[PDB]
Amino acid sequence: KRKTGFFFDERCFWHSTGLHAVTLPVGGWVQPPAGGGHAESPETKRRMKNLMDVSGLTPQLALRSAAPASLEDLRRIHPDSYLERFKAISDNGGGMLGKEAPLGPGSYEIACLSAGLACAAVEAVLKGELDNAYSLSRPPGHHCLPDQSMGFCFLANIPIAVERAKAQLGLGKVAIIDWDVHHGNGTQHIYLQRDDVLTISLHQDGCFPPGYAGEDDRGVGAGEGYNINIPLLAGAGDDSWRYALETIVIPALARFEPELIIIACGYDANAMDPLARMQLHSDSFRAMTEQVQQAADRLCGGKLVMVHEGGYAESYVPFCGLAVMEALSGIRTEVQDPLLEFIQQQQPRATFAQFQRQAIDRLAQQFGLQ
Amino acid sequence: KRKTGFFFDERCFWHSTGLHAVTLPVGGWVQPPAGGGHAESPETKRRMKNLMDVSGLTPQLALRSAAPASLEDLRRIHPDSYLERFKAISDNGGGMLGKEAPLGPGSYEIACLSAGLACAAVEAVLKGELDNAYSLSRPPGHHCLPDQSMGFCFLANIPIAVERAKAQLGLGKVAIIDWDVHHGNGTQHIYLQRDDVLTISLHQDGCFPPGYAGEDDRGVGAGEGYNINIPLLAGAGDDSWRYALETIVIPALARFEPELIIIACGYDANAMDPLARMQLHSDSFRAMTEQVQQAADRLCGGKLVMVHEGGYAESYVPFCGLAVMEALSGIRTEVQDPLLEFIQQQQPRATFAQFQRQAIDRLAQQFGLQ
Amino acid sequence: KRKTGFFFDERCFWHSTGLHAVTLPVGGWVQPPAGGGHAESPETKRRMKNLMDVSGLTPQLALRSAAPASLEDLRRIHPDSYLERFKAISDNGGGMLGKEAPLGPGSYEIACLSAGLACAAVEAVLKGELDNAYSLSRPPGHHCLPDQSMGFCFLANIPIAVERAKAQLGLGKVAIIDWDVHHGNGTQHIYLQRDDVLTISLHQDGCFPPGYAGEDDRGVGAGEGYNINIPLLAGAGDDSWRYALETIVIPALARFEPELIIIACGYDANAMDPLARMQLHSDSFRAMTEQVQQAADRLCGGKLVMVHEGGYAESYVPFCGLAVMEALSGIRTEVQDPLLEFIQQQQPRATFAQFQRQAIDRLAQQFGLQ
Amino acid sequence: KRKTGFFFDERCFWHSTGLHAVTLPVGGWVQPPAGGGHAESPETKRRMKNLMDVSGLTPQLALRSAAPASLEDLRRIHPDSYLERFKAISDNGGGMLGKEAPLGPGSYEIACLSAGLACAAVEAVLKGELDNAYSLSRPPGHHCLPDQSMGFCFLANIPIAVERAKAQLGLGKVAIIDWDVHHGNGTQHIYLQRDDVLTISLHQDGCFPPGYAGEDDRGVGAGEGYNINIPLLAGAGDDSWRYALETIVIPALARFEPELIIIACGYDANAMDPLARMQLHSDSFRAMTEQVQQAADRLCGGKLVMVHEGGYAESYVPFCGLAVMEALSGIRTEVQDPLLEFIQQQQPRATFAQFQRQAIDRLAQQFGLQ
Ligand SMILES: O=C(CCCCCCC(=O)Nc1ccccc1)NO
Ligand SMILES: O=C(CCCCCCC(=O)Nc1ccccc1)NO
Ligand SMILES: O=C(CCCCCCC(=O)Nc1ccccc1)NO
Ligand SMILES: O=C(CCCCCCC(=O)Nc1ccccc1)NO
Ligand SMILES: [K+]
Ligand SMILES: [K+]
Ligand SMILES: [K+]
Ligand SMILES: [K+]
Ligand SMILES: [K+]
Ligand SMILES: [K+]
Ligand SMILES: [K+]
Ligand SMILES: [K+]
Ligand SMILES: [Zn+2]
Ligand SMILES: [Zn+2]
Ligand SMILES: [Zn+2]
Ligand SMILES: [Zn+2]
């Protein structure tokens, strides 16, 4: 039906972060790994693209790369002191950009590309050249603060793309919905005092950043009311995430009236993920994509951009990604998710489901949406 | 303080199960993995032993191997038709023992060793040669039915050891507590009609076998009252698992009065596990070990055996295993768990904790323990 | 300069062969591998394509896939009894097609694709739509006999493409030059009695098939004089391989006067290869490509097809492949081979070089070329 | 027959060197590896010990660890400026100790252990507590210069052990025979001016250090005549290496009359090694061990120590190591090398063999041994 862009570049798969045993740095009591290392591996993302190819989906999409984000683009978000230190470490062979921010040689130029893919996806959709678009942006962006890398993120991908669109393409109100299972603390910080961007994060209560829930953080000054955190309970599955979208996110969008919806699209709420404890399956992600595409249809002429964030289940993320691209493009391949029925049977029973529904009801009331 | 046995054999690390992408068999829509493959990898278990060595713990334990379980030992549990088919597949190069039971060449002899390590651990403790013991039994046992492999298990390790002890060492009542995060369906089936073994399983509601909770399954005929299932909510952490032990398991043991406690000790309730959604840390496992050691001290002269089951977080399981061996032996090394404080901060907040406490209270009432 | 085809398909990277420690099957005394497994891994070939992309070469080539080779195409070479057994094993989950021929689920359809890429490359060049072409055909073909898989090969890729071109496109004389470091025993067998195809193999003396040199095997009946084996000494490097091309292969082509040259292009003579003992570098492969392209220019209007075979050095093969594609297309990227100068310094000294030159001189005399 | 020490420590397997694709550092044109990384991996050495265990050999050996080499031990070879910089990099998380010397966190203490295992092996044999001994020393030592790391070596293991034995145990003349396939440039440098140690290196001509042969380097001043380099031709196999031992090494030992023979025992001349081009099999290494054990029996009361160096064929090195330990201890297990007959068939034919024999004859004449 739609003309759907897929923005990606081989170079994004070349970003490295040194030797880790899953998330632990090697040394001391942490033995080096015999096989695969850091959880933020290129394979998480490359396997999704590989499955899109063998499924026959890829040739029916508009495939694109992009020019890297320029220095000027980076500077709408990040000060030079941060950028220079990121680039120095990148240029000297890789190393640490403060605690638990490892990067590799040439990571700077690859992070600029990753942000440039997001910039170009936003631009194509805004200019009406595409109906909607997905950016396979690695490294991710949603934890990055202006002057601090965190949670495997080095540049604030979505804010860079948005700020560029506001400066060059007259973009007005935009909503950012972050269903990566971790809290989008970088996006929240950047837009905390602004009423022209609504930031919504669904996330696992207390997961990352650790110990953060955030429901009382609504924004400050002019931005008060324009930040929504939905801390879902660890263990929640398909029913809970879809109910939260239905009850909180879709009504919030209706009230705000954006001209563009952007999804920070992680898959780490999937049921086999080592970096969170949620129980989503590929049909969960397909249903959430349909819900936000339908909202985009009602509110901003169908303009929807999705930007890849997290997801660390190497065998399972591809099936979730494929589902999203199928829902986005309107094209169904012959692929059947081999774990779907298994994960459907593992879903929380009625007691938990109702408990979580009531917690979501209390949040919607607290946010003035019910 | 204690004389603690550690039973293990290099050959257990040589059991293989063919090519998988985590748990998915390769083929069709599942792309072959570039690095590590099946989640049930030798590294999950070998890294624990490696950390015990470098920590200085190993030389303070009684290290042992064992003779494999004999055919006669296997036949107290398993009929010959199953055993012959397992051995035929093992002897012909590996393959499938029905659906989703892959094994490799020589797996039969390695499964017999794994069960023999459990037999010998039970025997050493029963005969008073050791105070307590741990068996690093791979492949695991707690899903195996008499005539059906399941959940990476090929022989019923703990039942074989128990049935041998009943036949050769006059063992009477024994309690089996299974804190692997999946349901011990094999142990439950084998002892379902018996009052001489109490089987207790704490597990994630609906996880594996998928869609099974089990609270109403209490045993049949003479065995009614002697099976206890505790389906904990996905997402539960340290508070919940320890409260369930305190409120249900310790009182159940006090009522039953065993002569030996055996733990089916998996670590897959750890907070980084891809095969479940629980939030335990190394101190959770240390505290659960202390609770059951203390019960063994009160009830059966300190006689406690632990038998390794699951745990698939390759970087994290070693820290959990070390904690158990430290608590079992009474010796504290200088190792500090580098994720402990991180996972403590991710723990469910009070709302969930109280909800899960009330669910556990309802189970204890239903089981006549409150 | 040229219009160069690059024929490849994502599905070729999905062929698997079960669990191996490099080339050894697991079991018995062979411990399962912790990381990567069979040497014939998709990464050997995928890393070459990945480097072509990041170098900027790929968009300057004519990229294509192909229809799989049909049953009729396969049957010009292979009898049905072989084909049916290959397909049965493929369809039943993978397994063994006799000794040391492991394949995986769906390998049949992927081998048909691999052969179809070669068919299409030959066709495009023959019809004048491309000047020259490379096929990234995996699994490889040059060891496959009509009724027997061997050396990781399941279908005879190049013979299938040639026989199809003879039947459908009026192809006459064709020369096949095989510089994979192992002997092309499948190609040699298929064309042994034919004067319409000249098969030339440069290979490591005695490497694979093991213990075979082959210099006295010249062909039989009408085919006598139309098979040339050049068993080079283990340890030989750039000087030796280029001298053999210069002294034996180029004059043999001049005498035969082909209408098309096909290269069976392996990279396993590279200096870091675990499956042979030769000392070639990326400039060796670039120089050999230039030599055969120049011959094609003199003899058959520039018509040259290259078909990927072997090469198992995962970090080094990409640099060798890139060099070939640069020489084939006439386009030089900015990539500099980081091991080039190192391997140049390891090359055999003058004593060995002259010894090997004299051995090549004796062969050229024996073949009537000097 | 013999009482054979095997000195090893789990901690030696914990030394890491960052992210590499085989030997290439990641970055620039080198894509990060999906699976295993640096060729100098713990698995090369751990798989040998694992096979010794499952073969039943290990319990028949004298197993030992050791105290790390002290600062005083290190300072007999290395100046403080080098040692302090090695330790600073080790203590700060790992990094580079000049070009192509990557090390990891804590590598300093693990290198001191590796050297301490060699010290203790030499001591046990010298004091008559063992007949002979093997040290599984990782990281290796034979390339290390006093003030420069090279070729994966950080401390000069064998020189440290020898210099300590000369200072504390009255050791006189000692011969060091290095059959690692690369040149022992560190040992050669350290003893170049000394007549109390004879250093002999068999190595692949020009391999590592690259472009070095060394036959004319015989020693300087008092040390002239006490260094022997044997640059064997790339491609050489069992016949050549054993003939060189027979014709050059055994007569050189007979002339020098040592009180102790030490072997720098690498396995990287094995026929599947990516880091050299030789064709040895497990029986080659067994025969070389017998030759030097027999010399030790004739010359120095059977006193032989072997110290692990290189070997990077992960599936094959274990079989070669097992063979050495079988020959050293006098105990034959039931293990049969599954590649033995294959590699026997790949061996160079008579033409090459005789050529290499004549080259060895010329060296023996040049060294005054024929
Ligand atoms: O996917 C992400 C990043 C999530 C990071 C979660 C795990 C972080 C971690 O493991 N932290 C840690 C590591 C070592 C020591 C202490 C904390 N964001 O969307
Ligand atoms: O650790 C265990 C075994 C748990 C197994 C859980 C995952 C099983 C799985 O992934 N099942 C599956 C695979 C392919 C297709 C459908 C189901 N028991 O303690
Ligand atoms: O690259 C190839 C295939 C070469 C195969 C060489 C190694 C074969 C092997 O390792 N054989 C073997 C394995 C196990 C036992 C005995 C032989 N052809 O071009
Ligand atoms: O095993 C050893 C060490 C041998 C090292 C051989 C390979 C070195 C290498 O690959 N060098 C290189 C890497 C990158 C760029 C240039 C040279 N010694 O016994
Ligand atoms: K989120
Ligand atoms: K805002
Ligand atoms: K359980
Ligand atoms: K019971
Ligand atoms: K060849
Ligand atoms: K012919
Ligand atoms: K040497
Ligand atoms: K000397
Ligand atoms: Zn995330
Ligand atoms: Zn489990
Ligand atoms: Zn080959
Ligand atoms: Zn070496």
DSSP string, C105-120: TTHHHHHHHHHHHHHH
**By CB neighbour count within 10 A (0-12 exposed, 13-18 middle, 19+ buried), where does D141 fall?**
buried
Q: Do the Cβ atoms of C284 and C244 come closer than 8 Å?
A: no
Beta bridge partners of A21: A24
DSSP category for residue A226: S
Domain count, chain C: 1
Q: What is the dihedral of CA A70, A72, A75, A79, to 10 degrees?
A: 90
**Closest CB from B33, B210, B342 relative to A210:** B342
Sequence-distant (6+) residues with CB within 8 A of C88 are none
Q: What string of DSSP letters covers A174-186?
A: EEEEE-SSS--HH
Q: Resolution, in Å, please?
A: 2.0
Instruction: Enumerate the β-bridge partners of residue C198.
Output: C175
Contacts of C26 in chain B (CB under 8 A): 16, 104-105
d(CA D191, CA D198): 8
Q: Which residues line ligand 2 (CB under 6 A)?
A: A 338-339, 342; B 23-24, 100, 143, 151-152, 180, 182, 208, 266, 268, 275, 309-310
Ligand number nearest CA of A183 is 5
Residues in chain D whose Cβ is within 8 Å of chain A:
13-14, 16, 18-19, 25-28, 31-32, 34-37, 41-43, 93-94, 96, 104-106
Residues 6+ apart with CB under 8 A from A72: none
Q: How far is CA A108 from CA A147, A187, C335, in A?
A: 14, 20, 20
Spatial distance between the Cα atoms of D369 and D366, rounded to a whole number of angstroms: 8
Q: Which of D22, D24, D145 to mutate to test the pocket of ligand 4 (most atoms within 8 A of CB)?
A: D24
Chain A nearest CA to B111, separation (Å): 24
Closest CA to D93 of A150, A16, A19: A19
Our CA-based measurement puts residue B46 at a distance from the nearest CA of chain D, in whole angstroms, of 11
DSSP element (H, E) containing D107: helix D107-126
In a domain, B25, yes or no: no
Residues sharing a CB contact under 8 Å with residue A216, sequence separation 6 or more, in sequence order? none
Structural domain includes residue A354: yes
| CATH code for the domain in which residue C275 is found | 3.40.800.20
Q: Is B180 annotated as a binding residue?
A: yes
The answer to whether residue C25 sits within a structural domain is no
C-beta of D40 in contact with ligand 4 (< 6 A): no
Q: Is residue B27 part of a domain?
A: no
DSSP H helical ranges for C191-281: 238-244, 250-256
Residue-range definition of the domain harbouring residue B227: 4-15+36-366
Check residue A153 and give left, alpha or beta (phi > 0: left; psi -120 to 50: alpha): beta
d(CA A52, CA A315): 14
Q: Is C172 in the pocket of ligand 4 (CB under 6 A)?
A: no
- What end-to-end distance do the CA atoms of chain A give, in Å? 35
Rounded CA separation B236/B281 (Å): 12
Establish whether the linkage from the previous residue to B210 is cis, with ω within 30° of 0. no
C205 is in an annotated binding site: no
Q: Is residue B29 part of a domain?
A: no
Report the structure determination method.
Answer: X-ray
Give the β-pairing of D24-25 and D20-21: antiparallel
**Cβ atoms of D302 and D258 closer than 8 Å:** no
Tokens of B214: 């089990």
Distance A332 CA to ligand 5 centre (A): 27
3-class secondary structure per residue, D263-315:
EEECCCCECCCCCCCCEECHHHHHHHHHHHHHHHHHHCCCCEEEEECCCCCCC
**SS3 (DSSP) at A16:** coil
Distance C72 CA to ligand 3 centre (A): 30
A73 Ramachandran zone, left/alpha/beta (phi>0; psi -120 to 50) = alpha
Could you tell me if residue D335 is inside a domain? no
Token duo for residue C238? 């750039």
Query: CA Rg, chain D, in Å?
Result: 19
Alpha-carbon span B317 to B43, nearest angstrom: 10
C195 assigned to a ligand binding site? no
A21 Cβ inside 6 Å of ligand 1: no
Q: Examine residue A138 and state whether it is found in any structural domain, yes or no.
A: yes
Does residue B121 belong to any structural domain of this protein?
A: yes
Three-point CA angle A241, A242, A246, nearest 5°:
120
Residue recorded with tokens 């295992």: D117
Residue D148's beta-bridge partner residues? D145
- D21 C-beta closer than 6 A to ligand 4: no
Please, what is the Cα angle at C316 between C310 and C318, to 5 degrees? 70
Can you point out the beta strands (E) in D26-182? 62-64, 95-96, 102-103, 132-135, 174-178
Residue type, C51: L
Taking contacts as CB-CB distances below 8 angstroms, the residues of chain B near C16 are 19, 26-27, 32
Question: How far apart (Å, rounded) are the C-alpha atoms in residues C134 and C266?
Answer: 12
Strands D95-96 and D102-103: antiparallel
Contact C309, C142 (CB under 8 A): yes
β-sheet bridge partners, residue C199: C176, C227
